Symmetry: C4
Subunit: 353 residues, 4 copies
């Protein structure tokens, strides 16, 4: 068969177009209105370079590309015009990277679907927005009273009666969601819900082993992580830290080679001095990590020229061990920034049509 | 109809070309001189790949692209040759990003249009350039006498008779523009003119509540912002700070998570020491912000190994919280640098033709 | 001859296709089944833009390109379909950069090929993985006892009986590979094997000139480099340091211009002060290197305004001398990261077919 | 006329090809051997996409592009095959950026052209390489004796008899080039030769006003700049500093806004404290420049919370004022690195053919 896309002749076999017998070109009654019985061809008055990837979809047997010149709002119309189907439309989706939104879990009630739209979806309604302005205020007061409790003018109980205001309110915002979810096993895997409970598990022990009395106080600071729910930027931070496992491990490892190698070199170049502040290898560990990171503290300083040549080569190599696996992390942060701020806003406006 | 662009056959319907009945291809008396009655086609001896985007303009119904291979001085001629009109020429403008220059407000006088070309447009004439060499000298002396007034050899009035020289000259450069503008409501929105007046409002109170006597002195430093008018680079800085609102907010927020999380960790790892300099959580706030930024001050130092493992993980994570939203800011600065230094100089030389 | 690649007419001479008389198009009995005796041409129903680089392979006489639009899994099939041969397939290999894997040296035995697959190839079998979990544990204990030996609570012999456990185990892991290799001259060039022996050469002198007693202790730290064998990331670090010879030399040279030029400027601007801490040019060398690297130590500080203007211009220029040859190094690290993690996994899945 | 580039039909007028009546297509006796009297066309068996830019050269009237897909060693052959001439070949040169090498000034003698190839061209011959190994040794000794002269164990004359060895040798390497050049006005503009003489002008005053006795000593350090002649990397540094005038000025200006604005804010937030180390605005200038650059010195520290909030906002904004005009400088350094190391080595191997 011969197809004439506004002047460009594409000519393929008939059994290639019969592989997909539900599309425009596969159905002999839908493409029959585009025939041209004077030249024995089908004439479409469409975009020229967009058909080079439509014909390759039939030839390869199912793959969908996108040519570089044609934009996404143009190529999303040719799949809609040639009637390739939603199977081929969704295969165009993840090829561009934009994954479709997952279906929310419906609990199938009217009391339960209302309270699900009341708290977990704060953007929808009025009292949905009413909790969100106080779910920032309840968190910020709890972190700052945890700071104000540690202030030593009071340490070195009205400070108990102000913190129970925030914690039963923390318990208020959890007991309204303990019974209001579609599922319960999926409740125990979502890390948004996984730390919230840990905030109460450390307080319920307090009303009813010194090392244990301190450990708990450390978990009380976890309440900072509750800000991740209603803050859009932290998920971009949360996904970048969670997609960069094997690159973050190389960041702390590449300096650990530089810690041991340079603490030994500053030691043996200053072992022949009684006034040397570096007593041993764990003594000069803090010097080796404060010079490679280019902070500097000045507690332990080399004095001789043999020890002033290793730290100068330590600070130079200290940049060249920490700035090497960094720029893949700032690119992953740019990916989750560009697939949340203008990723789906430009995709789903012309991907769902 | 068949169009033959120097060997490449483009073939579209007649009602597609009749959508725009004022262009070259739409008018049956302007395209009639390009006919070829031996082959029944129109023959243009033009550039080949530039017509693929001209024909798509008719087919889509008004959109203008630009193919990647053809440069801007070539594609700006094909819109001029096919006579697509200024409506289609200006639709090509903002597609490339280069917005046209806005019309200046004409006050419609001869006394007023002369003084408008005298001060606000310093590049035009001689006395237009005469004020610009002294509108740098009047500003630099006022900031440095504000510095020299604060010098304590004189603090701990001939210093009044030197600062009134600059301020009535500041008032000279404002009263010549109070009455010389096209409009007055547009006068009160332009931020160039919005701070200039604030420079006098803080001085006129002085000739005619201790906290109030200090606040005013703080506004006197605002006179630095008057340098933004005649300096080309500060608008590139001013637009980059003003186009990066939601990214600058994430920069100060991502360290605020790192301030509280790391000040608690250095506290509880050093709470069991009487010689620990960290008294409390606001006490070690300054330590937490000076280590993540990699400055270091040395006023408060961890001494034990349990406290020397958190600051080493603080400085490493301190780079990975502040360098993440930075590279979008240095790209926006590159955009306003490339759309002011070679943006309009390459555009309007071939966009207005 | 005329070749019709699904609508696109390619037309070349016959002696061009006869340059390679073993391919599809060169053999008059293999291409004869694609003939079309009504139009006098050969009709292939293949991808359109992939044949523009197949025909140029015949015309140029052997070169293989790849067009930008067609991906690698598509263009690797057209070389497989047109039967260009493995000579042309391997010429496509290094054009994409992906070099094929070299053949391992076979020692041609059954005792020797088994022990070669036992230790040097730890990913293969069970006891191949059994040594790898203890070849990390034997190394980490040896570096930390070298740290613990230097701790001065014991310095200022049961610490001999714990280090011989690691060293005969180091000798265990070398004597199993002294006699188990295909070759011996290739044994003495591989830098993985070149430092391992140096670890014993410094210990065998110890059981059987003070400067010599210290030098040896410095080589004992070399045992850190033994971690490079079973760690995947260090080869990416090792290749980036070994491919950047002339760029690393310019990094230490560009600051050496800044060391001498700025130590002289801080000297002569502070030579007229008796309280100046800078005694001479090697005295202020440590100040010049700690300011350009932005660490800061505070041992020697300028006090006057003439000396506070050079260090402010030193720290500004100190970034602009060290950050200039850095970004080619972080790009080379990205190349060896992308040719080891997804380089050969995407290449050899469709390069060897 | 119709031109058939191996299957692609290009069809232009005859007067377009007659604009350049010396090329292949312009001469009716050179293109006559490519005619095809059965189809009435010219048949070239060349590369297909390379002719789209050859035909546009005739149509536009002289411009030469290069299409993106075709590499430089391919497109440099089509200009050689179609015989466009060296006028069109050199117009292809600077379009790719690679400027041709300038002709060296010939003094037209045999004594003078020999000594010109003896010293200024050290790569050519044996004694041309003989001076280059001692023109590094004569410079390095002169900078280090200028360092060793300033050492105070000798200050606080055999050190005169060692420095005259280097200076008459400096005079040896200048008097051999005073009389050995093609021109003398071009001698006084080349900045390589402009500082060399300044090295003697400061020594000839010494053998034959205290401020003048110190100034000279400062110029003696200029001898570092003599290393730029035989060092390949410094010209890449020298061109990057000399092509970035208006960007380097914005680097020192953007912090000068941050110096005055933040020194005033730290002053007025600490003016109500008698223990505040910041006496005045020039007193806290050194604090403001050491925090934005992230060095830190610790001489003057804020103590109150009102002064600990400005320096935390100073160090954050201090990165965002200095890292903004930096990445255009590291790109210019990459341009002069890629046009000196692989720029002309890949160009002139196929640009001069």
């Amino acid at each position: 068969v011969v197809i004439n896309i506004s002047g460009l002749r594409f000519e393929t076999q008939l059994k290639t177009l019969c592989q997909f017998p539900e599309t425009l070109l596969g159905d002999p009654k839908r493409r029959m209105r585009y025939f041209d019985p004077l030249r024995n061809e089908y004439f479409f008055d469409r975009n020229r370079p967009s058909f080079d990837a439509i014909l390759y979809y039939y030839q390869s047997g199912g793959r969908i590309r996108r040519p570089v010149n044609v934009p996404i709002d143009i190529f999303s119309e040719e799949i809609r015009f040639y009637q390739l189907g939603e199977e081929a439309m969704e295969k165009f989706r993840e090829d561009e990277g934009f994954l479709r939104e997952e279906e929310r879990p419906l609990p199938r009630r009217d009391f339960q679907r209302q309270v699900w739209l009341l708290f977990e979806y704060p953007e929808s309604s009025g009292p949905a927005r009413g909790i969100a302005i106080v779910s920032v205020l309840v968190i910020l007061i709890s972190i700052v009273i945890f700071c104000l409790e540690t202030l030593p003018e009071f340490r070195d109980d009205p400070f108990f009666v102000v913190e129970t205001l925030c914690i039963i309110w923390f318990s208020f915002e959890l007991l309204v969601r303990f019974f209001a979810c579609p599922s319960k096993a999926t409740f125990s895997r979502n890390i948004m819900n996984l730390i919230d409970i840990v905030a109460i598990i450390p307080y319920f022990i307090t009303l009813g082993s010194l090392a244990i009395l301190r450990v708990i106080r450390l978990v009380r600071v976890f309440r900072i992580f509750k800000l991740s729910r209603h803050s859009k930027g932290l998920q971009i931070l949360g996904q970048t830290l969670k997609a960069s496992m094997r690159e973050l491990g190389l960041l702390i490892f590449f300096l650990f080679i530089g810690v041991i190698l340079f603490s030994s070199a500053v030691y043996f170049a200053e072992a022949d001095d009684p006034t040397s502040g570096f007593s041993s290898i764990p003594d000069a560990f803090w010097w080796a990590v404060v010079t490679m990171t280019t902070v500097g503290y000045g507690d332990m300083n080399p004095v001789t020229i043999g020890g002033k040549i290793v730290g100068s080569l330590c600070a130079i190599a200290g940049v060249l061990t920490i700035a090497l696996p960094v720029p893949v992390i700032v690119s992953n942060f740019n990916y989750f920034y560009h697939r949340e701020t203008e990723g789906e806003e430009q995709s789903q406006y012309m991907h769902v049509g």
